[model samples]
Target: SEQETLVRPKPLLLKLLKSVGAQKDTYTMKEVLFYLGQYIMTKRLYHIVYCSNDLLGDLFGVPSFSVKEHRKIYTMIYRNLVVVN
Candidate 1:
């Protein structure tokens, strides 16, 4: 059977992912989200009373984002990966 091939992140994205302990050169979308989720938890980036700080501003190039707009974070990060496969 053929195995699954994962999407490779761009150099900048890979570097950011590595900082959060995602050591792989490539990753599935879920895998990327998984690592980011852990990163958010550890960094306390999620906020209920106010907008969460964008500790990942270097990756997304944004200053900060609201809690309700959290889903945008995953989309923005995935944008840095090559999905041509």
Candidate 2:
């Protein structure tokens, strides 16, 4: 069948990763911070962290995959970085 519809999911983290790297498959802290800041503009990330932490292991405690320190990153978003001030 050639009528298969491919649905895409919202890859928020992946977009952040891509923008940071902005090349092929590489990324940097600057991009991470920048993109994260962009996301924070909406002031909503609890569910994202909740998923990464509750579903996946604490990224900081034992990050086995991506460079993202998911826990600390989440904390930074929840407490520090994200602000209207």
Candidate 3:
């Protein structure tokens, strides 16, 4: 049922991402992505980091990302990393 609920919307892409350890949590999905972005594109990695952003875009669909509501996403990811490590 869980997969059923989440599988139909984004379907294939979401499933593929999940299989690779990308989930809805802060660990892999958020934190790991942020860490990779920082390391590969400087700590201030953002849209300007084409290689980083492009990779994230391909992996996480973030090129068309919206942060109007979830403005704290990066901070959340960072805080989660701190907690986990």
Quote each prediction's TM-score.
0.66, 0.30, 0.26
Candidates 1 and 3 compared: the better one by lDDT is: 1
Q: What residue pairs clash in candidate 1, if any at all?
A: none
Error of 2 at 22 (Å): 5.8
Enumerate residue pairs that collide in model 2.
none
C-alpha RMSD by candidate, in order: 4.7, 15.2, 10.8
Query: Distance (Å) between predicted and true CA of 80, model 2?
Result: 20
**Model 1 lDDT tens row, 1-85:** 1113367888877776788888988787777767766766776766442223554666676766654665676567767878636
Kindly report which residue stretches of model 1 are placed more than 4 angstroms away from their true locations once superposed: 1-5, 47-55
Arranged by TM-score with the best first, the candidates are 1, 2, 3
- Candidate maximizing TM-score: 1
Q: How close is candidate 1 to the true structure, as a TM-score?
A: 0.66
lDDT by residue for model 3 (1-85), tens:
2111211213333333454545653233443444444443443334344333443445443444433434544443333223322
Candidate scoring better on TM-score of 1 and 2? 1
Pick by TM-score: 2 or 3, better one: 2
